[PDB]
Amino acid sequence: DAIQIIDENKHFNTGILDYINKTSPADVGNNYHIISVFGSQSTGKSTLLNRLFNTNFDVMGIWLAYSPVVSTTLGHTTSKSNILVMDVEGTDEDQDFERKAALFALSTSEVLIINIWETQVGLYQGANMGLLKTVFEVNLSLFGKSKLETHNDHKVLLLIVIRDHVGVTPVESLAKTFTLDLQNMWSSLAKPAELEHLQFADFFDVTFHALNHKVLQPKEFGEGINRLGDRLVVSNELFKPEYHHDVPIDGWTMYAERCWEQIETNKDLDLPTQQILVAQFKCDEIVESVFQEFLTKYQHHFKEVDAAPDFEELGALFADLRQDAFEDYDASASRYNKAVYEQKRKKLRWLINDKLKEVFDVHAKNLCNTLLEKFEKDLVALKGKDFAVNVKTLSTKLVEDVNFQVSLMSLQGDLSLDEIILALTKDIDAIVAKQQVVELNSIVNKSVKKLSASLSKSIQFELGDPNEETWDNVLQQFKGVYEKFGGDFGLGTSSTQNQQAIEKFKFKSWCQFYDVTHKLISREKLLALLQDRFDDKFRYDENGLPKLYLNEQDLEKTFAVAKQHALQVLPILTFAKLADGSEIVPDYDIFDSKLREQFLDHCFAEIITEQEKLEVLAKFKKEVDAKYIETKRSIV
Numbered sequence: 001d002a003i004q005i006i007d008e009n010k011h012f013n014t015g016i017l018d019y020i021n022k023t024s025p026a027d028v029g030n031n032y033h034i035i036s037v038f039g040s041q042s043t044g045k046s047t048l049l050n051r052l053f054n055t056n057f058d059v060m061g062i063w064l065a066y067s068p069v070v071s072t073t074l075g076h077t078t079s080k081s082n083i084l085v086m087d088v089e090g091t092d093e094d095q096d097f098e099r100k101a102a103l104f105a106l107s108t109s110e111v112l113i114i115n116i117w118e119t120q121v122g123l124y125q126g127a128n129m130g131l132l133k134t135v136f137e138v139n140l141s142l143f144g145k146s147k148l149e150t151h152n153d154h155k156v157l158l159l160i161v162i163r164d165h166v167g168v169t170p171v172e173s174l175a176k177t178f179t180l181d182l183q184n185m186w187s188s189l190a191k192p193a194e195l196e197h198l199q200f201a202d203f204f205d206v207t208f209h210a211l212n213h214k215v216l217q218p219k220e221f222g223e224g225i226n227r228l229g230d231r232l233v234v235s236n237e238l239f240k241p242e243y244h245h246d247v248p249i250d251g252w253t254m255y256a257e258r259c260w261e262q263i264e265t266n267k268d269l270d271l272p273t274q275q276i277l278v279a280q281f282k283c284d285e286i287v288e289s290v291f292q293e294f295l296t297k298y299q300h301h302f303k304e305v306d307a308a309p310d311f312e313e314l315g316a317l318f319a320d321l322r323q324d325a326f327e328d329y330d331a332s333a334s335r336y337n338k339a340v341y342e343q344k345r346k347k348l349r350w351l352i353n354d355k356l357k358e359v360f361d362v363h364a365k366n367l368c369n370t371l372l373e374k375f376e377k378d379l380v381a382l383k384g385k386d387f388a389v390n391v392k393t394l395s396t397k398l399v400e401d402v403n404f405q406v407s408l409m410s411l412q413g414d415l416s417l418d419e420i421i422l423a424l425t426k427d428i429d430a431i432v433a434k435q436q437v438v439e440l441n442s443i444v445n446k447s448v449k450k451l452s453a454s455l456s457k458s459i460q461f462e463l464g465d466p467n468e469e470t471w472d473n474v475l476q477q478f479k480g481v482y483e484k485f486g487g488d489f490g491l492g493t494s495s496t497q498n499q500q501a502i503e504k505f506k507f508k509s510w511c512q513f514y515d516v517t518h519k520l521i522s523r524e525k526l527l528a529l530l531q532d533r534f535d536d537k538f539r540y541d542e543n544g545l546p547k548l549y550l551n552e553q554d555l556e557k558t559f560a561v562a563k564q565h566a567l568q569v570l571p572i573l574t575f576a577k578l579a580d581g582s583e584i585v586p587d588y589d590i591f592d593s594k595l596r597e598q599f600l601d602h603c604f605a606e607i608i609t610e611q612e613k614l615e616v617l618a619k620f621k622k623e624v625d626a627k628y629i630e631t632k633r634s635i636v
């Protein structure tokens, strides 16, 4: 059963798309053929179509039908190209319709069948060289521009069926005559100057087929048909790929609709660009439908944010999803124009690659803040021990297995890492700058304490035998370990702030020097020291044996000797001075307001004040007097 694709009011049939869908399976693609038969009314057109292609047009607009089977001398044959057939009746008057219908047929058909009667071959009378000339014109206008400018090999086959052939004239003889009439008419056709050189054969192939008298030789007529079949489908002698219009079957209705609308409204129809447009439209909607198949298929994974992040197991789902999309797209779209098809595939690629990249970023720095957290941790756990290097080694393996782990889910480099490492880097550097200040300050603090611990034991030893050179001995030691700190830190320096860790480490030192001297030489200690010096000479022998006073010359004179021995030490301990007589001045004037806690008025060298010295002397005397009185009550 046949469908009218164009009725007499030049309207295009809406049902065509569904009609094509029924007769053509998803399989066809480019392997189909369009054949048109073109002629004035009742010249055997529907009859030839029904007998040859087995199609059901009515025998006494434009009608389309699928051919289930071709009539051949090998019987009913199904070619494996789908064959569609158009019955084009250009007259019923009108000359406008004729031109339009012929334009349609030539913009969609690979073969044009022209039925001409014999005794009337070579004459409008019962051929229409008027009809052929229209075909020549319509063909030139459709393909003359392409042919000149690209030299494309496109042709259409003219298949001339000679009807009611009797046989006194051989078909070979009729063919030669008619061929030369054809070329002649072509040469004389109005052409632009620059196509003047093109011939009939640059646009057309011809061949002939004689059919015997339908009414008077029915058996032979049947046979001649079957033989046309052999030519079409059994011997595949007629169809050629250079006749084929490059639009797969699924784009065909769109192509036919667009061609007809331009034709009907007298617009400039250009078939190359119209074929590109249908390809572009169709690949586009395959891109979109596939990309939507890829998406609810996506969501049902990726804001399911998930438990245990495996990077190779699903770094390859990325591949699967993207590969299955490629395959559903290749299936429908590869039939289309190569350039259009690949272009829109890339479009599909960089739509998939961008919603796959949002999972890329999430699972990525979830692993960065997972690894930065433990980075940060055993930095601290590496308790300041040689971070000279031990930053560089830790950053290295870190920055490295991020690369490894995350590469698993990039696609041979499609989703770039350049962004993510550039972040992981700055989050690593801005946290060595974190704890560099911690460990810089840390080595300051402990360097200060066993400075002060050494200072304290230096002073203590010196206290046993105070000389006018005991401050010398104290400052010597101090300034010694004072200059042994710096440039030796196992960190990233800052030539500047390596050395201003140093710079008042040098303070806290000066500060400590003051604090320790004043602790170790407080009134209370000084007094205790004085009593010890005193007893050493008043309570014991040189030997160290407890003393036994007999006389009071003995007591009184060693009493004087004991006191002086003790007090000879006061002028030295109450004020920090070297033998030269010079006051010890701290390098930094401490007790300064913001010179103090910029780094975290008294006298630094005054160990004991006047007022304190006077209290010490009063207390020294009272005690020393008592020891005296007693050891004299025990002499009697």
Ligand SMILES: Nc1nc2c(ncn2[C@@H]2O[C@H](COP(=O)(O)OP(=O)(O)O)[C@@H](O)[C@H]2O)c(=O)[nH]1
Pocket (backbone or CB within 6 Å): 039, 040, 041, 042, 043, 044, 045, 046, 047, 048, 058, 059, 060, 163, 164, 211, 212, 213, 214, 215
């Ligand atoms: N003598 C003769 N008559 C034919 C031939 N083919 C068809 N007819 C007759 O011509 C009439 C119209 O044919 P038809 O197929 O409807 O021509 P169409 O209108 O152009 O499709 C029918 O009655 C056919 O029987 C032929 O080859 N020879």
Ligand SMILES: [Mg+2]
Pocket (backbone or CB within 6 Å): 045, 046, 057, 058, 059, 087, 089
């Ligand atoms: Mg008809």
